[PDB]
Design a binder for this molecule. Structure first.
Ligand code: 52E
Ligand code: ADP
Ligand code: MG
Length: 707
């Protein structure tokens, strides 16, 4: 008489019913005999043992959070990370290597229907691929989840799968495609508390095909590079990989050429050398040079890149003091400035004059004011950030030029999306507002997609669709952020506070409270703080330095020197309105791309916060299924007809417990079923007859596996 009950340890737990009393129930925990008294409302029905480790949970005959968790947990400990759940897929990071990604296995999935194999990322990629050919439509695979859940690893498996089955030992273009992420990760990833290879940018990879299905080219867009990581890092964390690769792996020749000087010598490396376990930075340096070489980067190109990486570190070694009894910046030591100008190809005394005494065009004459130590420090830091962002964008453009070399744009594409999930931190700033905004758009596309798929299924069968679009809940919160006028949203207000002469951050928070103080998803929280109610939680924002972040100011004098650098590469980097405005445009264009594809969702789940293999943290998993919408899904299909079965199938399964309903001889499938149902005296509120299937409530079909 086993049942599921809430457990503070395990999330849910097996228990046997021992006593009832109206709405009360007394139960016996199956693990330790302990007695527990609950409301009948807290009890969840258990599925029969024939569904153990079921590969598609839509097949479950009792849809509830407890039964879902159990199935995911059971498969996981048998080393089975992939599970289907009706209209989307779920993946629990194993935190160890599995024998499931070989060349053999790739060939086994070629051509297969999702349900003819065990669930795998390969099968999502293959089915998306066949649909591209068969329907002449563009496809997308979206990989989502917390830091460390496994989005980047699954993205890379879809690339390596496609480069194998849609090739035209690989061939030049596919060899280069498989090198793109190794290059981008060296420059865009960093060791973080949650992930030793954290993506500090979002990316969307477009792969282009023929009418025939042959890979013809590819293109990559990146989003939200964490520029500021180049300047300072939190406890236990590293900057981008490339800085440790170069310092640890440079030849003696290179060490000299690029004025390199070791781990403890760089203000921009906050924690000096910190190791990544099971990787050595010198070996990694070698993999990264090899990848750039396969990509077609000339030796001089590779060296110019590394010269820039080095100069970013040098900028950080400049020190400004003040003149006696003033605030005016002075540069008593000259050495850092000399080394960096050497690497940047400009003139150290013009560079100095630019930082300390900028000429400012101001109409009625040219003001040449001296800068405070605070001002010169900010300028140098803005410059190192801008310098590195430009370097990443340059590497991205040249990766793209090597990958779109054939000038053929193909017939179709398959896009792969790899962007950070919704996460709440101790501090939530402008960059988190943008990430959390992006996930409002993405989660809405998900609710909407499920909505359209359901509505079409109901339409083709008769029955009876009375829900409004599932994605509409997210609209008020989206509108609070992105609305131009009427009431202007957070972004628009920011953009306006920026053209205000004597505005502060807190000035902005106050105008916000004024115009959105009573918006449904707003809440006043400290004087730069405010809250927004997102799909997955209340988030506290701190608006400190947002005015500056929206504007992203640089010293235009030194910027001008670098535009005329005597080094051709640095010159190219510097070959040339708000940060909020620009990002909104980037996100508008991405959503437009996605809405015009057939999307496949891959929900990545992190098992624990300790990077451990074979340990599942129940409440951590449940919280993640909540952010995803997986639990809204269970609730919504609970209020519907979760079990749906074709006539022919209903016949040859329950003719056992209903043999005498159907007379001997041929009969139409709907006819036979109607008889089987009348022969069941089933309450007409618990089923619906469709064109090809019967639609059952939960868990009407469970009731029949016995009685
Ligand atoms: C019945 N169903 C299942 O797949 N049920 C298992 C299941 C559902 C949800 C979370 C889960 F974990 C699991 Cl095991 C298929 C279609 O039902 C949906 O999937 N809508 C849906 C709506 C949502 C609305 C908002 C947010 C998320 C949503 C997710 N999803 C259709 C099947 O008959 C065919 O395979
Ligand atoms: N399918 C997998 N097989 C083996 N290891 C994995 C798998 N998925 C994730 N990992 C491990 O977890 C780490 C973090 O995964 P990653 O995909 O980088 O996270 P994110 O979702 O933040 O991109 C990886 O470095 C890898 O060690
Ligand atoms: Mg990643």
């Amino acid at each position: 008489k086993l049942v599921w009950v809430p457990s503070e340890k395990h999330g849910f737990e097996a228990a046997s019913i021992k006593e009832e009393k109206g709405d009360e129930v007394t139960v016996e925990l199956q693990e330790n005999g302990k007695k527990v008294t609950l409301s009948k409302d807290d009890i969840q029905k258990m599925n029969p043992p024939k569904f153990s480790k079921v590969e598609d949970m839509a097949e479950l005959t009792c849809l509830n959070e407890a039964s879902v968790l159990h199935n995911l947990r059971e498969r996981y400990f048998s080393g089975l990370i992939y599970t289907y759940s009706g209209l989307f897929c779920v993946v629990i990071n194993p935190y160890k290597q599995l024998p499931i990604y070989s060349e053999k296995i790739i060939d086994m999935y070629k051509g297969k229907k999702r349900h003819e194999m065990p669930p795998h990322i390969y099968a999502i990629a293959d089915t998306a691929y066949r649909s591209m050919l068969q329907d002449r439509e563009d496809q997308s695979i979206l990989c989502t989840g917390e830091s460390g859940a496994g989005k980047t690893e699954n993205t890379k498996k879809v690339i390596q799968y496609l480069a194998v089955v849609a090739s035209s030992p690989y061939g030049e273009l596919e060899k280069q495609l498989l090198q793109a992420n190794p290059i981008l990760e060296a420059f865009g990833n960093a060791k973080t508390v949650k992930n030793d290879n954290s993506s500090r940018f979002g990316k969307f990879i477009r792969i282009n095909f023929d009418v025939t299905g042959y890979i013809v080219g590819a293109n990559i867009e990146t989003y939200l590079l964490e520029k500021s990581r180049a300047i300072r890092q939190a406890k236990d964390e590293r900057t981008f990989h490339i800085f440790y690769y170069l310092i640890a792996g440079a030849s003696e020749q290179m060490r000299n050429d690029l004025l390199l000087e070791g781990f403890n010598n760089y203000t921009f490396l906050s924690n000096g050398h910190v190791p990544i376990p099971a990787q050595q930075d010198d070996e990694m340096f070698q993999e990264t040079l090899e990848a750039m070489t396969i990509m077609g980067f000339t030796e001089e190109e590779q060296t110019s890149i590394l010269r820039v990486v080095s100069s970013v570190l040098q900028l950080g070694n400049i020190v400004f003091k003040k003149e006696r009894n003033t605030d005016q910046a002075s540069m008593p030591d000259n050495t850092a400035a000399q080394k960096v100008c050497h690497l940047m190809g400009i003139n150290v005394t013009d560079f100095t004059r630019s930082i300390l005494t900028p000429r400012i065009k101001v109409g009625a004459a040219v003001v040449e004011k001296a800068q405070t130590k605070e001002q010169a420090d900010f300028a140098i830091e803005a410059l190192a950030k801008a310098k590195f962002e430009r370097l990443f964008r340059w590497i991205l453009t040249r990766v793209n030029k090597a990958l779109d070399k054939t000038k053929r744009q193909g017939a179709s594409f398959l896009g792969i999306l790899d962007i950070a999930g919704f996460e709440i931190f101790e501090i939530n700033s402008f960059e988190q507002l943008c990430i959390n905004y992006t996930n409002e758009k993405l989660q809405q596309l998900f609710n909407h997609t499920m909505f359209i798929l359901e509505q079409e299924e109901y339409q083709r069968e008769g029955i009876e669709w009375n829900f409004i679009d599932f994605g509409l809940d997210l609209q008020p919160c989206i509108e609070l952020i992105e609305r131009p006028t009427n009431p202007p949203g957070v972004l628009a207000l920011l953009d306006e506070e920026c053209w205000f002469p004597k505005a502060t951050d807190t000035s902005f928070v106050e105008k916000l409270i004024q115009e959105q103080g009573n918006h449904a998803k707003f809440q006043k929280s400290d004087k730069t703080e405010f809250c927004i109610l997102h799909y997955a939680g209340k988030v506290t924002y701190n608006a400190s330095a947002w005015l500056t972040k929206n504007m992203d100011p640089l010293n235009d004098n030194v910027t001008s020197l670098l535009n005329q650098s005597s080094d051709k590469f640095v010159a190219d980097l510097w070959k040339d309105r708000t940060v909020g405005q620009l990002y909104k445009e980037q996100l508008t264009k991405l959503m437009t791309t996605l809405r015009n594809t057939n999307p496949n969702f891959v929900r990545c789940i992190i098992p624990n916060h300790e990077k451990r293999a074979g340990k599942l943290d129940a409440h951590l998993v449940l919280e993640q299924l909540r952010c995803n919408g997986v639990l809204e899904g269970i609730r919504i299909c609970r209020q519907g007809f979760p079990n749906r079965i074709v006539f022919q199938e209903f016949r040859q399964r329950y003719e056992i417990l209903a043999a005498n309903a159907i007379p001997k001889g041929f009969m139409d499938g709907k006819q036979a079923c109607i008889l089987m149902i009348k022969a069941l005296e089933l309450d007409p509120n618990l089923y619906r007859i469709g064109q090809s299937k019967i639609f059952f409530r939960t868990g009407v079909l469970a009731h029949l596996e016995e009685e």
